[PDB]
């Protein structure tokens, strides 16, 4: 159903918020998505964005992406909201870059454009990935952002516990100050169980034009549960060329236990270095 | 306007004739200790003897340290200005610290003829308004500047506030600090109560506000429900009074707008206990949501 | 307008004659008080007695943490502010090129309508000046126009701002070997009644002779200014029982309401822990 | 074209593979590491079979095991004279030129443009200089004439790279004209640079670690400590005896292989002083007592102070 | 020129040494310290024969021993009107004048020259302008008459010189138009300001410490602590009893000697207030227990906190 | 130059590696305590390499300049080490004569290589105390030395496995681990009792000092307890204390008296622990 496998309650959590926007009761709030990484917290917002009409704007940006050396965060954040403003014909991020080279000029100009109506203001949805590495003065811009009536519905995402804020020396929950934190809604996500992962491997192999046997799935569902999903996807295309070497006709279990014992996860390679400095750095 | 949309049930501070505090009146419930004390403060601005000092509302978060700031701005004439700023709204890099600290400060003083504040009119700006008092055409009504989260203001903007309150036409400002013997921001070594330095501690009246009971919490979420027009039942409200005493009140008032529309998802108009039993699992608070990432990492 | 301080007032007379006999050029005064011992009027204790025209300025040691202007240019204005010339004795900030005013007043001295004078300059909370500014008063004291500098602190053996070593009072040793450090012994029980009898008269309050004996029992463990903030609100609560004067039950009505800084950091230890 | 950094890697000439994707023992230069040389084989097939949409490799082994050699074999098994630009982690920090351009000085210097003149996309030379060159060479591959031959970028000691490089590099690989990038490391969990806050495996953020296929290289047995010195001796004309080689493999297993392979040319020009052109054991002891190594010469400075 | 840095020690005339290479009990405005007073006599001998191969003096010993005094007796044993210009460690930081200028200011406040009219090198006054001077005054010394006498710089508490000022001085002391520079400190293995991990003795870098000669200044006994306060009294024209010196000396043993010299001026002024002839045993106790010193007044801000 | 049997012999193998061009890509690192004359076995690679080789003895702490920037205290020092033979002139003084700029000269000197009327010469650059440098300056030795107009680097460091400045990753001798894979690390040794007299029977001849033979054996008894920095510093001060009674040679107490007068670098700070660490407890 519509690409999004699993996370049934946390997808229904959007269905609460999807009527908070149509009733007109989000104007000031914001939505956060917590969770262990590799779960779909970068993906629930997409189907969330599609459910406000056919042509909603959507701008997934990252929190470590704020380190732009040509583009200051006073202007990186400011066009980011204006890449989520509805203009019917073409958002406001592309308007000022050619028609001007101002941000108070087009708003007074769209104060004139509100009454004609060839383009109607439907401000869409944002997504700001990895908010736990977003500086403190950027959060104060988010407070000043949602004060226009042409505001977008902010969606955020964090994967860190009680940490410090980026700019101060206070340990606080999630790495957000508590001027926005208690105004936030926490759509929490859970890591997949056994049965949830082996549909995803069936999904990713279906769209990679890769044929696979049934017994290759249950070993890759052991690994896909333990290590990650995104490492188990990487072994799919690697085992699709250890099968093709013997020409295969189907990918098998020892065509995984070759490759799973050939490459490594994001986990074991550190552990090989752990017992490597036990006489090196313990002499 | 959303900054006081969470306080659209306070039409006054609710005191009787003898200067005492009654339980439930004009919106405010519980809190009868400190509502005596902010009755003293609003009477010390009606008698002009507030000789350059302020109010600090110590106590845990969510207990109502912002609703008194609108209550004091209600009892003082109810047409006064009000600008609740937060100590993290100053830390912006597009503008300097002190000007966005003063832009709210020049918004609190109400002038009377039309109803204007100083920020519409914004040294020589300070004197022509002082000239109009001399002629007697416009008399200033000092409103309430609420500074929440005051430990996030540094010592480089506090001494600005120790100057812009030292002048005569400044309004009453009200701090709110939900922490203890903190260490002052911007100076790296010195500590003081509530993150407020010594030079400003000489001008504050530390009014403590205490926590709530589950009986007091059930009255207030009814009032926020009855103001938004969302019919909730007592079995449902008793759960919100146990989610209230679990985390905060600010979380439990926040769930009224989604948990009503969960019945609109299900077709009904009212909130029952089975709805809030679901939306506690759908949306979380902020403290337990970092417990989960301390569990899913440390599993 | 003192009360008490049977020793540290007497030190202000010994320091006063050093300004007369010229034996003060190079030295300065350190007032190592508590916050609530009233050092600022003792700083004026040699400004109401040295000369009636000798000016003063009180700039905090945290005021130099400035964002509009630099650290030391804002200091040098507040250092020149204490030095006047008789005409009213006009300060050297209102004649404000930076050395021409120094060179012009090197001429005006013998004329008859302009004569140089020293002054007093008060730096309170002195321990928040870094070593960049302690080197400024290392050299600005050695000029021909040295004001009687009085420094006020409440910090013991601490780290200097700008360096990382230990030091008394936030002062580096080069401006501390040659200092007069006076100690202000804190207020006492007979010392606190007389200041509180002064303070009620300054706000037209008739007070009891027994509620004082609890207000001075309450004005010791907390502060003095806590017993000052009460006594203007203790007037208003009897202005709402209509009794025209204040008795012993009336402070413990408003002592219950308005907390102090020591019972409101322990009450932020009950919740927060 | 800096032909100095790969001077010691002149003896590798491929991967030394069988027909069905199995490693040999000693062919095309390398001896041993046959567990990881299989993993280079399935990597190099993917770059040929176009299933490498912007993905990277991170070899992860101790210092002195062949991480730079095994990422030159991936440069040559794609083809000979295929561009290969080895940089290191602490080379991006120049006070002259900003550090983001220094990666573009390398990440663009690992492509072979094919017209026949062959050139790198860097050597066609300011984000317009990066941007507008891409749309002409994107027109070139659909023009039915021209083509790129993507090489290998090699970043060693990656934990010195900071977060303003990792975010630019990961955002750079989304272009279709992006060559492969082969990382390296020698440590476990180590904090990121550029933000200096929290830990991460091998100094790699999770924004890049979903493009990472970790290949683990192992250590070397004392038997493997001798052929690898032998092949580096046979390229430089270093006539060395076996009884000294058994001492020289003892050096490679006492501290490191990289130290025990740069000892040869001082030990060859010690034997040219004494006269005997063929090296014996009497030289190479007196070049391991005279010269030292870093973890043993830091110990000596601790053995006094 | 400045005078108040010297006026507190306006009673030392020379080192007070007989020609037998030794010292005496007390002479020439000095007392005690017989181990160190010969050593500064050796250094003033090595300026006379110019065997000082770019060297310097470090005076390592506790505060209240006369490290400013002995390195002023050196500056006067070279001759009358030999320049002397002491600075402290935290002089070299100012927003008005940066680090390496105010070093060279006091470096060339010391370098005297006799062209007959006495001149310094800071009389003549951007290091391009400084190095331009050095060659042409290297002509005037080799014209024969214009002989230069090297002044004595005195750096007090040398630890607060940071690392980017020391190596300037190593590139400034190496000239032959250099004055003899005298460092002084009492700190232990001090971290140099700027390196954060290097433990070097009295805060001197390991290259500059190849030039200096470390001399101890030993703390006084209360016998020899008494005669100095008598000597500092009689230059002021301020009389005193005996037992007051048995108090002012035996409170100087308690904290420092640097404190007690700051007490002759108020305790005499306590006698002018009360209309007394001189200072006596109660006049000190109404200053010693009324005025305070920072090593014994910072304890009262910790006792009142606890 | 007396001593260093195990450091000059390896330095000869450093030398004759330059003659065959095998040094191209590497550098030397003389690891040892100071006082061992690390600037003496490094200038031997300027004496024995040829009498016309430029040789610059800068320090690593001397890069700390407020008037400079961290790309001009090294680009001068390489061009004050590389030179051109055409009275040989170094390459840095060619920048002076084209100023009253390297984007024209380093092609112009490369033009000279085909005629040979001006000949390039490989020099030697000495960077003493290189552990004070940092990665924003270590990356220029990986950036200039890989060129073909390059000298042979020689470094020196007494610090052990310490933190590199710039980061918080410890490493031997404060150098990046990428640069330490091409260093020729030759150690120096502490001196010997018969060998320490040789520098003292050559420092006495610097200032014609006549010294008794018990005094030599007690100065080396002094010099190997504390330092050779300090033992040289008592030579000259033994003279002007012997010129009281004129001596005809200094004596045993005469070197024992001035040893009681001046104090060495590590005994003197032991008296601070008798004061600074013994007043805090009391
Ligand atoms: N005593 C009270 N009377 C009326 N409303 C209250 C009371 N206490 C809390 N509230 C309501 O509960 C919410 C939380 O109070 P507030 O002080 O704003 O929380 P916080 O302490 O986080 O700022 C407010 O919206 C306020 O309207
Ligand atoms: N398996 C191998 N086959 C051939 N040569 C090798 C092998 N492993 C290491 N070497 C040689 O040893 C040296 C160290 O390898 P390299 O990867 O460059 O350093 P490190 O192993 O420390 O990353 C190289 O010069 C390489 O030529
Ligand atoms: N042995 C001494 N002989 C003569 N004067 C002394 C002696 N000891 C101290 N003084 C005087 O005491 C003062 C303190 O000496 P100074 O060196 O300035 O302080 P410190 O010893 O703490 O550095 C000096 O001005 C000096 O004149």
Author numbering:
A (entry chain D): 58 to 146, 157 to 168, 187 to 368
B (entry chain B): 26 to 137, 146 to 155, 188 to 364
C (entry chain E): 60 to 146, 155 to 163, 187 to 363
D (entry chain A): 24 to 138, 146 to 155, 183 to 362
E (entry chain C): 24 to 138, 146 to 155, 183 to 363
F (entry chain F): 61 to 146, 155 to 168, 187 to 368
Which text from the study accompanies this structure?
RUVBL1 and RUVBL2 are two closely related AAA-type ATPases that assemble as hetero-hexameric structures made of alternating subunits and comprising six ADP/ATP-binding domains. RUVBL1 and RUVBL2 contain a unique domain II (DII) that protrudes from one side of the hexamer and defines two distinct faces of the ring, named ATPase-face and DII-face hereafter. Each RUVBL1 and RUVBL2 subunit contains a nucleotide-binding pocket and the adjacent subunit in the hexamer provides the arginine finger motif required for hydrolysis. RUVBL1 and RUVBL2 are essential constituents of several large complexes.
Here, we demonstrate that RUVBL1-RUVBL2 hetero-hexamers can bind directly to DHX34 in vitro and in cells in culture. DHX34 binds to the internal regions of the DII domains in the hetero-hexameric RUVBL1-RUVBL2 ring. We first analyzed the structure of the RUVBL1-RUVBL2 ring using a mask that removed the influence of DHX34 and the protruding OB-fold domains during image processing. The most striking feature in the cryo-EM map is that the N-terminal regions that contribute to nucleotide binding are visualized in RUVBL1 but not in any of the three RUVBL2 subunits. The structure of the nucleotide-binding pocket in RUVBL2 is not altered significantly with respect to the crystal structure of RUVBL2 bound to nucleotide. This suggests that it is the displacement of the N-termini of RUVBL2 that is mostly responsible for the loss of nucleotide. Thus, DHX34 regulates ATP hydrolysis of the RUVBL1-RUVBL2 complex mostly by changes in the RUVBL2 subunit.
